[PDB]
Amino acid sequence: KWKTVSTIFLVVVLYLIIGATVFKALEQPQEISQRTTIVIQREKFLRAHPCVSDQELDELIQQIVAAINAGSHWDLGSSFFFAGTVITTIGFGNISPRTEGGKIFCIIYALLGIPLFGFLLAGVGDQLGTIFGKGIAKVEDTFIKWNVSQTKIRIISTIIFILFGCVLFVALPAVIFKHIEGWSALDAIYFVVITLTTIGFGDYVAGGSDIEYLDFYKPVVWFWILVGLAYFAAVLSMIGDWLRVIAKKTKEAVGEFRAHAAEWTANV
Amino acid sequence: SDSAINVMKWKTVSTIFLVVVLYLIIGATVFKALEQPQEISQRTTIVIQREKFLRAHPCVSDQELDELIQQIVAAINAGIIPLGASSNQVSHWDLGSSFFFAGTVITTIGFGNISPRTEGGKIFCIIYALLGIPLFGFLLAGVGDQLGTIFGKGIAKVEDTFIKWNVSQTKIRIISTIIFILFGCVLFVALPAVIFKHIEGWSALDAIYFVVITLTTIGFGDYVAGGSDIEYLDFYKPVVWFWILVGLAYFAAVLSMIGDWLRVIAKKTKEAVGEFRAHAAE
Ligand SMILES: CCCCCCCCCC
Ligand SMILES: CCCCCCCCCC
Ligand SMILES: CCCCCCCCCC
Ligand SMILES: CCCCCCCCCC
Ligand SMILES: CCCCCCCCCC
Ligand SMILES: [K+]
Ligand SMILES: [K+]
Ligand SMILES: [K+]
Ligand SMILES: [K+]
Ligand SMILES: [K+]
Ligand SMILES: [K+]
């Protein structure tokens, strides 16, 4: 009978409004400057080049906009990488089907692909989930039977998972992307988190930005994605579980606050 | 006994892993076979337009000309209106557009049509998704539970009406699953896609292609219901993310059903291979 959805809905709508205000506060400033720095650039080109005028430039800019539709791509290895983004749902979009057929196939390819991949990822996670189990198996004896009791060890263990997991699937792959791909420390981490969360803006793509890389680099990447996605899968789930606790902790802390405020009121 | 099943599990993953490689391989061939041809006609016709400009303007920055385009495309990664006229640009990070941005973040769609360029917006976006995505999962879960019972009530009315003599519980379930996909593809695919056709000016395929890519949490960003400037009554964009909310809940089950069907065929093909193994002309 009880809905319980509206409350979570509003928290989400609230979580969005807070986000919106923070993003425009952070991004719109640099927007304006770049939007001014772009105006300075057009006039510079027309002034520095009597060869070009208002008429020629408008025509040029319009064709480069048409180039935005496309930008060799769709090669033997790119389309394979494309299909990867589809079944995983990341969908960087940097390369997408421009053919009515490539779209219909993409539609069919996704409806069938996504469910398929889930089975693989489901097994990949299950497999690594037990691998982690073996690792923490010897960790639950050495310094567990010793001083600290069992109820509080469950925290030390979870910290080892995130700490260690963030190194293998976040730190190391970001460090490699930094050198090989030429990205910064934040951009690398930014890419990893955006990629392994299946968001995939497409602003940063390890396969893209090509003047430098080898066919050994790109396979290990998609495998990284395969394995890393399972990591955030549990990480995202745990973070989701932490919220469930805080949701009940706050729900009983609010019950505490009236129970004592009611007490307090009845004194006269 | 404990390790015996582990041995049996890895055997399943590996086979599925190899099936995934084939599916991608078969996909890569189908895409590059479809897309690369038109990529060539454009890749060559773009050199023609440069030739119609390079030689048409010898006084141009011929070697430096490509440096200009680089800055344009470098600006193309962000919303740009760099023309002689329309020097008054529109903000992609205004009060309303960033809200839509956060909606794409917590739902993992990530159209990428607008992404943060600030070290803060990035360090915020990361923290925002780590906590946001799980949060949205609860919403979509309840939204599914809620809409799932709205179907339970309506399915009860239709199942008893079709109740006749010699009704078979096992075979009646099929009738219900069809009507689910029927109204589902109407309310969340057909209807909202037709509206996008007229409001967004998108073609027939571009609408359904958009609905699918969006509600399958892929979101290439090639098409977005709130990307352009056209008029956007602002009674349109709000209904968009809502549809996304419930539409996501829909494909959540649709995609989940397909996986079920795939796992049925996975058995039937696995035993059909055992039959052909067995007999194959005695
Ligand atoms: C970041 C958004 C946090 C909003 C908390 C709302 C709490 C409502 C009391 C149940
Ligand atoms: C280059 C340093 C990037 C640090 C990102 C970590 C943000 C905190 C996430 C909780
Ligand atoms: C740091 C913001 C975490 C938001 C917690 C949400 C509280 C749930 C209230 C029901
Ligand atoms: C893309 C999958 C083509 C069909 C493969 C059938 C299963 C192979 C194992 C027998
Ligand atoms: C186009 C048919 C797709 C069905 C694939 C069957 C996979 C069987 C794996 C055992
Ligand atoms: K893009
Ligand atoms: K996703
Ligand atoms: K996800
Ligand atoms: K995306
Ligand atoms: K995505
Ligand atoms: K994208």
* Distance of alpha carbon A205 from alpha carbon A224, whole angstroms: 14
| Residue with token string 């208002």 | A54
- Helix H, strand E, coil C: the string for chain B is CHHHHHHHHHHHHHHHHHHHHHHHHHHHHHHHHHHHHHHHHHHHHHHHHHHHHHCCCCCCCHHHHHHHHHHHHHHHCCCCCCCCCCCCCCCCCCHHHHHHHHHHHHCCCCCCCCCCCCHHHHHHHHHHHHHHHHHHHHHHHHHHHHHHHHHHHHHHHHHHHCCCCCCCHHHHHHHHHHHHHHHHHHHHHHHHHHHHHHHCCCCHHHHHHHHHHHHCCCCCCCCCCCCCCCCCCCCCHHHHHHHHHHHHHHHHHHHHHHHHHHHHHHHHHHHHHHHHHHCCCC
Q: What angle do CA B217, A10, B114 make, to 5 degrees?
A: 40
| Torsion over CA: B86, B77, A79, A195 (sign) | negative
**Chain A within 8 Å of B101 (Cβ-Cβ)?**
yes
* Cβ-contact B140, B246 below 8 angstroms: no
The residue of A74, A124, A127 whose CB has the most chain B CBs within 10 angstroms, and thus the best one to mutate to test that interface, is A74
* Distance of alpha carbon B253 from alpha carbon A38, whole angstroms: 46
* Distance of alpha carbon B82 from alpha carbon B85, whole angstroms: 8
Kindly give the number of the ligand 3 atom that is closest to the alpha carbon of A8. Answer: 10
Q: Which of A:37-66 have CB within 8 Å of B?
A: 38-39, 41-42, 45, 49-52, 54, 56-58, 60-64
Tell me if B22 CB under 6 Å of ligand 4: yes
| Residue with token string 């057909």 | B190
Distance B123 CA to ligand 2 centre (A): 6
* Cβ-contact A183, A203 below 8 angstroms: no
Q: How far is CA B41 from CA A102, A264, B48, B186, in A?
A: 16, 80, 11, 37
* Distance of alpha carbon B124 from alpha carbon B277, whole angstroms: 57
Among protein residues, the one whose CA lies closest to atom 5 of ligand 4: B19
Resolution (A): 3.1
- Look at B218 and A110 and tell me if their CB atoms are within 8 Å: yes
Nearest CA-CA partner of A29 in B91, B71, B82:
B91
Domain of residue B92: give its range.
Answer: 1-282
* Distance of alpha carbon A124 from alpha carbon A19, whole angstroms: 33
Q: Closest approach of chain A CAs to the CA of B50, in angstroms?
A: 9
Percent helix, strand and coil across chain A, each to the nearest 5: 75, 0, 25
CATH of the domain at B254: 1.10.287.70
* Cβ-contact B243, A102 below 8 angstroms: no
Best residue among B269, B270, B276 to mutate for probing ligand 5's pocket (most ligand atoms within 8 Å of CB) is: B269
* Cβ-contact A48, B15 below 8 angstroms: no
Among protein residues, the one whose CA lies closest to atom 7 of ligand 1: A11
Experimental approach:
X-ray
User: Binding site annotation covers B177?
Assistant: no
Q: What angle do CA B149, B145, A117 make, to 5 degrees?
A: 125
* Distance of alpha carbon A201 from alpha carbon A215, whole angstroms: 24
* A116 C-beta neighbours (distance < 10 Å), count: 19
* Distance of alpha carbon B86 from alpha carbon A65, whole angstroms: 15
* Cβ-contact B236, A134 below 8 angstroms: no
Nearest CA-CA partner of B248 in B178, B144, B150, B154:
B144
Among protein residues, the one whose CA lies closest to atom 2 of ligand 2: A186
* Distance of alpha carbon B263 from alpha carbon B201, whole angstroms: 39
* Cβ-contact A227, A196 below 8 angstroms: no
* Cβ-contact A203, B118 below 8 angstroms: no
* Distance of alpha carbon B99 from alpha carbon B60, whole angstroms: 43
Per the structure, how many domains does chain B have? 1
Largest CA distance in chain B: 88
Half-sphere exposure of A215 (CA within 13 A, CB side): 5
**Contacts by B165-174 with C-beta closer than 8 Å and gap 24+?**
none
Q: Which of A:126-165 have CB within 8 Å of B?
A: 126-127, 130
Q: Could you write out the DSSP letters of every residue in A39-72? A: HHHHHHHHHH-TTS-HHHHHHHHHHHHHHTTT--
Q: Say what the alpha-carbon torsion angle A249, A250, A255, A257 is, to the nearest 10 degrees.
A: 120
Which tokens sit at A32?
Answer: 């304006």
